Amino acid sequence: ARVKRALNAQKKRRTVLKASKGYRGQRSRLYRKAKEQQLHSLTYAYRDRRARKGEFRKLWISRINAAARANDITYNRLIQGLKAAGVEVDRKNLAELAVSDPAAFTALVDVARAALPEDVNAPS
Amino acid sequence: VIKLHDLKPAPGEKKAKTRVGRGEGSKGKTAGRGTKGTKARKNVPVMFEGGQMPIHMRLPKLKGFKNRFRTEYQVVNVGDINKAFPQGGTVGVDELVAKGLVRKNSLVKVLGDGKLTVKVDVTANKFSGSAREAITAAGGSATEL
Amino acid sequence: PKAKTHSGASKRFRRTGTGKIVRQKANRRHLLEHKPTKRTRRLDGRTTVSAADNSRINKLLNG
Amino acid sequence: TLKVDVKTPAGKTDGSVELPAELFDVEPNIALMHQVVTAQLAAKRQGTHSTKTRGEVSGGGKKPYRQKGTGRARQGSTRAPQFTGGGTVHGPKPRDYSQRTPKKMIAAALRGALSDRARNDRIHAVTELVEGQTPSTKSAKTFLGTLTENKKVLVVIGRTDEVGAKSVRNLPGVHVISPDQLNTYDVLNADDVVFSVEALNAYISANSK
RNA sequence: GGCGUCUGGGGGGAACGCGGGGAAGUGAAACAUCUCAGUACCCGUAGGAAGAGAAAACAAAAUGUGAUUCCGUGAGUAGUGG
RNA sequence: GAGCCCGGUACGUGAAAACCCGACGUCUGUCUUGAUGGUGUUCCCGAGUAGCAGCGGGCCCGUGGAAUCUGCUGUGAAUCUGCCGGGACCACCCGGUAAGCCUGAAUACUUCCCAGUGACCGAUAGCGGAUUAGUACCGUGAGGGAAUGGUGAAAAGUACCCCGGGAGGGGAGUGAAAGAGUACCUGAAACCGUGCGCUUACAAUCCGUCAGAGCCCUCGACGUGUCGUGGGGUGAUGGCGUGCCUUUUGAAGAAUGAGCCUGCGAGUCAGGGACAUGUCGCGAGGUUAACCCGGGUGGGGUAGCCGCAGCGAAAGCGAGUCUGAAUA
Numbered sequence: 001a002r003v004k005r006a007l008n009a010q011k012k013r014r015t016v017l018k019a020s021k022g023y024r025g026q027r028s029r030l031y032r033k034a035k036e037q038q039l040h041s042l043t044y045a046y047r048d049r050r051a052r053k054g055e056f057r058k059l060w061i062s063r064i065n066a067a068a069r070a071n072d073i074t075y076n077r078l079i080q081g082l083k084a085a086g087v088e089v090d091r092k093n094l095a096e097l098a099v100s101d102p103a104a105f106t107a108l109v110d111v112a113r114a115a116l117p118e119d120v121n122a123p124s
Numbered sequence: 125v126i127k128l129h130d131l132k133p134a135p136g137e138k139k140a141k142t143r144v145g146r147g148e149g150s151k152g153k154t155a156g157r158g159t160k161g162t163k164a165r166k167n168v169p170v171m172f173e174g175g176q177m178p179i180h181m182r183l184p185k186l187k188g189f190k191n192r193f194r195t196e197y198q199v200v201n202v203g204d205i206n207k208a209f210p211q212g213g214t215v216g217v218d219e220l221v222a223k224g225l226v227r228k229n230s231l232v233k234v235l236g237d238g239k240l241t242v243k244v245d246v247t248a249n250k251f252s253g254s255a256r257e258a259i260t261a262a263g264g265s266a267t268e269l
Numbered sequence: 270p271k272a273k274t275h276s277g278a279s280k281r282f283r284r285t286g287t288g289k290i291v292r293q294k295a296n297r298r299h300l301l302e303h304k305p306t307k308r309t310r311r312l313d314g315r316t317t318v319s320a321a322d323n324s325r326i327n328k329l330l331n332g
Numbered sequence: 333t334l335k336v337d338v339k340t341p342a343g344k345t346d347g348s349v350e351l352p353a354e355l356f357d358v359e360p361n362i363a364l365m366h367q368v369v370t371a372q373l374a375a376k377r378q379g380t381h382s383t384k385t386r387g388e389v390s391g392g393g394k395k396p397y398r399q400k401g402t403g404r405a406r407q408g409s410t411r412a413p414q415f416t417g418g419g420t421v422h423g424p425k426p427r428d429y430s431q432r433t434p435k436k437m438i439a440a441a442l443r444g445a446l447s448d449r450a451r452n453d454r455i456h457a458v459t460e461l462v463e464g465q466t467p468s469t470k471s472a473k474t475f476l477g478t479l480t481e482n483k484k485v486l487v488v489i490g491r492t493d494e495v496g497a498k499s500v501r502n503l504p505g506v507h508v509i510s511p512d513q514l515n516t517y518d519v520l521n522a523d524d525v526v527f528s529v530e531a532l533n534a535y536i537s538a539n540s541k
Numbered sequence: 542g543g544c545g546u547c548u549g550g551g552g553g554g555a556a557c558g559c560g561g562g563g564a565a566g567u568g569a570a571a572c573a574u575c576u577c578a579g580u581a582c583c584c585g586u587a588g589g590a591a592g593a594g595a596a597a598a599c600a601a602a603a604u605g606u607g608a609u610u611c612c613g614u615g616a617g618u619a620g621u622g623g
Numbered sequence: 624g625a626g627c628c629c630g631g632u633a634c635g636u637g638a639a640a641a642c643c644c645g646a647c648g649u650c651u652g653u654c655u656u657g658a659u660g661g662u663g664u665u666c667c668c669g670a671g672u673a674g675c676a677g678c679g680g681g682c683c684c685g686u687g688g689a690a691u692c693u694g695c696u697g698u699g700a701a702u703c704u705g706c707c708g709g710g711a712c713c714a715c716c717c718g719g720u721a722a723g724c725c726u727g728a729a730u731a732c733u734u735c736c737c738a739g740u741g742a743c744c745g746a747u748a749g750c751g752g753a754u755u756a757g758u759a760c761c762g763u764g765a766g767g768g769a770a771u772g773g774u775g776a777a778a779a780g781u782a783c784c785c786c787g788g789g790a791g792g793g794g795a796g797u798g799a800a801a802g803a804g805u806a807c808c809u810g811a812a813a814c815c816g817u818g819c820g821c822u823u824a825c826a827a828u829c830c831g832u833c834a835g836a837g838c839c840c841u842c843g844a845c846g847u848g849u850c851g852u853g854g855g856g857u858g859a860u861g862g863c864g865u866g867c868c869u870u871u872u873g874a875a876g877a878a879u880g881a882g883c884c885u886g887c888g889a890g891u892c893a894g895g896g897a898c899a900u901g902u903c904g905c906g907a908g909g910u911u912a913a914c915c916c917g918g919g920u921g922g923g924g925u926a927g928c929c930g931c932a933g934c935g936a937a938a939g940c941g942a943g944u945c946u947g948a949a950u951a
Contacts, residue, residue, distance in 0.1 A: 002744065006886080010811080022857090024830055030813080030883065036867055037831065044832035044864070052833055055862070059834090126448045128520050131366035137902040144890060155890065159870085162570090170328050171275065172570075179322050180329055184293050185280040188936025192619070199932055199941080224907065225931080235932080237942055252941055272896050273617055286933055314946090324898095332897045363903055372920040373742090381743040390751045391767075414888050416747045417769095422891035424743070430920080432895070435911090437904050438921080491917090501633085502626090513921050538922080 060095040067098035071109040077120065081112030197250060198226040202258050203238015205246070212242040212264070217249075234259075234266070272332035282318065282326055290318040290326055334450055338457045338529055341475045349457050349532055352540050356450040358443045367433070368441035369517045374429040383423030386411055392418070438516070439539075445519040456480065456526045461489070461496035472499035476506070479526055486522035488514065488531045496528070511535045 013031045020027060020034035027037040065075035082089070087108065089097075097105045117124055144155035157164045171178055200220055208223045209215060220226045234246055236254030244264040251259075251266050259266040283291045294312045301309060318326050334356060338346040351357075392411030399406045411418040449455050456479050462471045476485060484505045489496050491510050500506045509518055511531040519525060527535075 001742075002748070004748095004886090006811090013812090026883085027830075032867085032881095032883090037829095040829080040864090040866080041831055046832095048833040048863070051863070055834070058862095125452050125454070125523070126360060126362070126365070126445065126520060128369070128517070131362060131369060131520070133366055134363040134902055137363065139901070153869095169570090170325065175570080179325065180275060180278045180281055183281050183295055184298065185277075186283055186293060186936085190619075191937055194937085201932085201942085204931095227931085228925080233941085235941060235943095237932085254941085270894055270896065271617060272894095274897095276620095276622080328898080361903085367903065369920090375920045376742095378741055379743085380741050383744090384750085394767075412888095416887065417751080418888090421889060425892060426743095427892070432911090434904065434909090435922090440904070442921090498633085510917075510921090513917065513919075515919085515921060517920070 057091060060091040063095040063098050064091060067095075067102070067105050068109065071106055073109055073113065077116060078109060078112050080120075081114075081116040082108065085111050085115035087111065195231065197233035198230040199233050199235050200225045200248075201235045201237035202240040202255055205234075205244055206238055206240050206242055209242060209244060212244045214245050214247075216247045217269075240264075274332060275329040278326060278329035282330055283315070284330075285317075290323060290330070291315045292318050334453075336455055336457045336527075336532075338459060339479065340459050341462060341471065343478065346459055346529075349529065351450055351455070352536065355443055355536065355539055356447050356455070358440070358447045360444040360448045361440065364437060365441045365444055365516055365520065368438055369520065371431040371433045372515065372517045374431055377429045379424075379427040379429060381424035382426055383420040385423070386413060386419035386421075389417070389419045441516040442514060442519065445516050446514075446525070449519065449522075449525050454480075454482075454524045456524065457529050457532055458526060459529055460493075461487070461528075462499045464495055467495050467498035467501075469499055469502050472496070473503060476500070476503070476526070480524040482523035484521060484523050486518055486525045487528075488525065488535075489528040490531050490534065493528060493530075512538065 016031055016035050016038055017028075019038055022028065023034065023037055026033040028034060061075065064078070068075050068078045089108070094105075094108075097108065142151070144151040146152065154164075162168060171180060173179070204225050205215060208225060209219075217226070217232050218228075220232060221228045226232050231250075232248045233250040233252070234248045234255045235252050236258050240258040240262050242264075243262050244259060246259055246264065246266050247269060248266075249269050251268060256266050281292065285291055293315055296304075297309060297312045333353060334351045336349045336351055338349060340346050386409070389411045392409040394409075396407055396410055397404075407415075409415075409418075413419055413421045446455075458475070458479070461475060462468050482505075484507070487496075487500050487506055487508045488511055489508065497508050500508060507518060507522065509515075511528075511534045514535065
């Protein structure tokens with residue numbers, strides 16, 4: 001039985017070419033170049049899914065730092081005071097409060113300042 | 125009712141053939157040969173040892189000759205006679221052949237491995253000493269061709 | 270085509286009752302003056318084939 | 333012991349045939365029968381498929397062109413496998429597919445198939461398929477309809493029963509076999525096995541003796 | 542030797558046959574004995590097939606087979622071999 | 624997609640002539656001028672032959688202790704109490720009768736003819752050759768050696784009109800279909816256009832990926848635009864980011880290879896081969912080979928082969944055996 005290769009190959013070629021819509025130049029037209037770019041794209045996506053959590057945490061920390069310095073307190077002392085006070089709001093919702101409900105953020109800053117020690121540089 | 129489409133091989137009877145050089149998933153680009161060398165292309169003969177004098181040549185040939193005129197006997201022990209002739213009686217060569225104790229067209233020698241407790245008359249080509257004593261001890265006779 | 274067995278291996282190796290492969294020891298043809306009798310006695314007879322050479326000798330004997 | 337009662341084309345019972353246990357009461361063995369019928373179909377297959385290797389295709393005895401200076405790939409012939417029109421690398425060659433199946437395996441598979449048929453009383457015996465000396469497909473078709481309503485039937489008649497063989501020859505579901513040619517594939521392919529009395533007795537005489 | 546008169550031959554053909562002549566690449570991890578291989582090729586000749594064939598044979602003490610050819614074993618054995 | 628429409632099929636039938644097989648004859652040869660079993664002796668029984676020697680060939684045998692067979696060169700016998708062979712050779716036994724010739728069957732093969740078959744190919748496949756094929760073409764020559772199949776059920780192959788020199792097209796018709804028009808089944812990719820949407824001329828980009836404004840489209844819900852468990856296109860802008868393969872200690876590359884697409888292109892087969900491991904049958908037994916008979920895949924076929932006792936160079940002995948003076 002002589003077997004022609006067309007159907008089996010066309011299947012995966014169509015899959016790869018469809019996945020490469022929107023690419024520039026050869027990378028969206030030719031199957032080989034599109035396949036190379038697909039390897040790179042999936043590697044990039046895998047790496048970026050891991051890095052995205054850190055990126056968003058960095059953005060939240062930036063916003064919380066801005067809103068805390070607006071209340072005359074630094075981010076690190078505010079985090080220490082919030083941990084001491086036992087409140088368990090994470091940085092995502094802390095930034096959400098900072099942007100959407102400034103009064104709530106000010107109240108949390110007040111409780112964090114209350115929970116802080118009297119001399120932060122003491123050998124405690 | 126068994127039909128032609130109910131017939132299946134036994135579990136574990138059939139095993140898929142492994143097809144090499146069919147992509148990096150199974151065995152790709154090398155078919156399990158590793159990188160280059162003699163063995164990556166054709167083969168190495170069994171008798172070859174790398175230029176060192178081989179094992180089949182640095183040892184001496186086994187001593188002696190073969191004696192083309194050697195006479196060989198198919199052997200049967202008296203224990204087999206006991207296990208196969210519970211009633212005794214005459215025991216010739218082709219009774220042993222019929223019982224499947226010896227091959228059909230061969231010289232037969234009786235040996236004395238087992239225990240013989242049946243009165244048996246044996247006609248073979250040769251006997252060992254212990255075989256003769258065992259056959260005569262049970263009252264049987266040991267005549268030889 | 271039926272397999273052809275190796276002639277030299279057939280002349281140099283033997284099989285015992287339980288299938289053990291047995292060979293003869295070397296250094297016992299000539300130059301036996303300076304060799305003490307204890308050396309030639311330890312070289313006499315036959316020994317079983319070492320485990321390293323068992324596969325090669327079995328291959329050379331069977332085919 | 334299972335009993336088969338003989339029927340005549342006139343529509344009346346004639347007598348009985350006793351089916352021996354060692355022939356029609358063995359426990360069917362699926363793997364054994366599978367191996368036997370697979371070997372049968374392999375023996376049937378003819379391997380008249382061939383291709384021309386790199387050395388059998390026409391021409392291509394001369395090295396084509398310059399190995400160097402060209403800047404092209406080095407080719408030793410125009411009939412190398414990578415070339416269009418060149419030879420085939422590992423292509424079909426004529427071969428024989430028959431297998432050397434042991435006799436006991438074959439006989440046991442046949443016995444298992446026949447015993448499976450006899451367990452579900454798909455075995456029938458008749459004196460003759462039609463009134464003698466003149467083939468008639470209508471009469472044989474009516475008689476087979478009386479015997480069974482299944483689709484595929486196996487008719488086992490003697491080699492001298494020319495009138496019956498010609499009578500059932502044209503029926504689409506009927507396959508006619510001689511008693512000494514009985515085989516696992518034809519038995520397992522049939523919903524019913526209609527035996528001729530003489531053919532049944534001949535099979536029993538050949539085996540049970 | 543010449544003259545006359547009768548009867549043949551000549552060349553072709555794919556494979557198969559018989560008789561002669563006869564490589565090298567290759568293997569031996571080199572190479573010359575050896576292998577390849579009596580192969581490739583060549584020469585002379587057939588026939589529908591050919592060749593062989595009617596014991597100056599085997600055998601081993603069996604009161605044994607009984608022309609030749611071909612098939613299976615014997616057997617990768619007995620042997621033979623830098 | 625037809626057993627009942629056609630050619631056919633099962634089954635029957637048919638040869639003037641030629642040829643091929645038989646048979647019965649004429650015809651020819653041949654024995655009967657014949658036959659048997661008995662008795663004691665001379666002659667004959669294949670000559671430049673056998674044998675021997677030298678040098679070779681070929682036999683499992685590579686010159687070896689080298690028999691049997693055979694070529695050339697020398698030498699060269701006996702006719703039966705003769706001669707040859709039984710692996711140097713000799714004696715004894717056994718077998719046979721060289722140097723004369725014919726011989727059928729069992730066996731090998733297919734240029735060619737006839738009838739069939741395929742878990743063979745289906746137009747880059749299958750023959751080099753489905754088409755002008757050993758052709759065109761290439762070479763002084765021996766020689767090398769291609770490419771090119773499919774409208775439609777039927778040609779019904781587009782009358783007539785219009786633009787145009789034509790080609791080509793538009794109407795009109797044929798057609799079931801002209802998204803079947805003799806550039807013709809289906810009509811993929813690379814490659815080349817046209818139209819619409821988004822984007823892009825202060826910007827250093829392995830060309831993607833993750834966030835993502837704006838714009839456009841779409842599905843639901845409520846009003847008039849405004850969210851939603853929504854979905855798609857494009858994406859200003861920010862973060863990250865050194866192509867694939869091969870060979871390498873190590874290459875994103877300044878080590879290797881690849882212009883692109885579509886087709887094609889690499890662990891296969893044979894053998895009662897060898898070893899190992901699954902599975903099935905039978906089991907101290909298992910199994911047949913050639914072959915024979917079945918229109919088959921079935922039945923027969925005991926010759927062999929492998930297990931069933933080993934030790935020893937071997938004679939040989941044997942649950943033992945070898946070495947050894949030894950139960951050492």
